[PDB]
């Protein structure tokens, strides 16, 4: 089973941390040395990691029963969540450095309710299947992340979507986190797929893989033949190669920026195409060259 990526332009694909269209590629700020996203994580041979689901219909969603004080969580289909499986139910939002505003609906009832989530207090323990209701009345709900705002705590914090929330309690740590992802070095930096997030600011949500890449990899389960997959970002209309990238087994892409000539300067309507398997230290040409 040869390795492939979907033959679809990036700008028609979805973020994997929220049901949002991809509008650009980007890199992390210099002071972001690593990420540990829990959604949008899938190895190149198709193993889902963290809380990543196959389908965008699960992404950035919660389900549980409120009693007025806490919401006791389940998986999105209603089956029980067990802490040893991950840091939260599958698809649970993983946006750190922000308050969440989740749109709550119910099967069999009329109306939608906004659920405002501060992810810092000792009642926010999704790893134990329990988060504060914050005024959400009793009942069973499905919620989807709708918009974000600056964290309520610490006061004065900015929105910072390079973070993940604290999933554990003030005493017990969330287990089975997806591992961190680091830049490979020697010029290669992580490539992120960006989406505009509604909220009272110019919020941009980064993710490591488009959601459609994830369900493709989960379906294909192509054996990871080499240490890295050399790819071309090609123009769909001409086939012209716009730059070399590497995809790594843990499930992320890199390039060598030279800079106002990084992946953000490339068009967003291009297609990633697998070229061959290469060594970890295969030296990429700089973007633009």
């Amino acid at each position, epitope marked *: 089973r040869p390795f492939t990526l979907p033959n679809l332009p990036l700008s028609s694909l979805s973020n994997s941390r929220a049901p949002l269209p991809i509008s650009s590629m980007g890199i992390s700020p210099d002071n972001v040395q690593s990420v540990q996203f829990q959604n949008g994580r899938c190895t190149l041979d198709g193993r889902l990691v963290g809380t990543t689901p196959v389908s965008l219909s699960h992404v950035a969603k919660i389900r549980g029963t409120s009693n007025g004080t806490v919401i006791n969580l389940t998986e999105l289909d209603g089956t029980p969540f067990h802490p040893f499986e991950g840091p939260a139910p599958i698809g649970f939002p993983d946006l750190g450095g922000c308050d969440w505003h989740i749109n709550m609906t119910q099967f069999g009832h009329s109306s939608q309710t906004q659920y405002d989530v501060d992810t*810092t*207090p*000792d009642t*926010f323990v999704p790893h134990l299947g329990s988060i*504060q209701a914050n005024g959400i009345g009793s009942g069973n709900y499905v919620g989807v992340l709708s918009w974000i705002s600056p964290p309520s*705590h*610490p*006061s*004065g914090s900015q929105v910072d979507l390079w973070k993940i929330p604290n999933y554990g309690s*003030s005493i017990t740590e969330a287990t089975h986190l997806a591992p961190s992802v680091y830049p490979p070095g020697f010029g290669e930096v992580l490539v992120f797929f960006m989406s505009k997030m509604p909220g009272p600011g110019a919020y941009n949500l980064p993710c490591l893989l488009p959601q459609e890449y994830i369900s493709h990899l989960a379906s294909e389960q192509a054996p990871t033949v080499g240490e890295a997959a050399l790819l071309h970002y090609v123009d769909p209309d001409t086939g012209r190669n716009l730059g070399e990238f590497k995809a790594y087994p843990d499930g992320f892409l890199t390039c060598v920026p030279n800079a106002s000539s990084g992946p953000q300067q490339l068009p967003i309507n291009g297609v990633f195409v697998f070229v061959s398997w290469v060594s970890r230290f295969y030296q990429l040409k700089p973007v633009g060259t």
Partner: antibody
Amino acid sequence: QLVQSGAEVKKPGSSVKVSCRTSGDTFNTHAISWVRQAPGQGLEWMGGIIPIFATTNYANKFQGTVTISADESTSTAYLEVRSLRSEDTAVYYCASNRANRADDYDYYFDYWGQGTLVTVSS
Amino acid sequence: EIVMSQSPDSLAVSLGERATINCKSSQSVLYKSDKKNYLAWYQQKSGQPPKLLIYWASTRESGVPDRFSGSGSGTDFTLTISSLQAEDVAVYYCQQYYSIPRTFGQGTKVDIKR
């Protein structure tokens, strides 16, 4: 240690500007809040400013009629209250709390001014 | 906003007896990251600005007589005057400084019972 300006009488609909001066050390290491207290009532936080970062915030009910400012050269914070009504008759307190960064000022109140009485009446 | 609720509204306790004042916050003020409760207690006598008694829920402010103590965690907090003295007649307020806006309880008036 927080020195407030004198009592004021204002007619309904007018505006009042109340000052709070402190030492320069306190001014550049603290957030300066304004807390008011209607006669025989509780304490109501109106808003605050961190002078060295020039960031402000306000409680929802005082948004639009209240502005809080700071003068770095005189170490003085100001509270301006427009569209005054009778229910705005209160003692307006200046209060400080530690502020190490723009996102690191979640601290209990440090000092209090002696208060400034604002009587709104005809 | 985090709403602070105190109980009782007023308290009358005989000299040398213990006064307890409860405070509940509508949302936990216990930051998981540092394990601190962002809660303070103040004393206000008429004509005066409030005075800090307790901070971080249980830490006694320097100069406060040690018959003042604070306890509780998360959403439920308690101020206790273990042996009330005449100079403690005042209004007591709890306050969260976890988030903006800062909010106080409605206050609890403590008088000497006779």
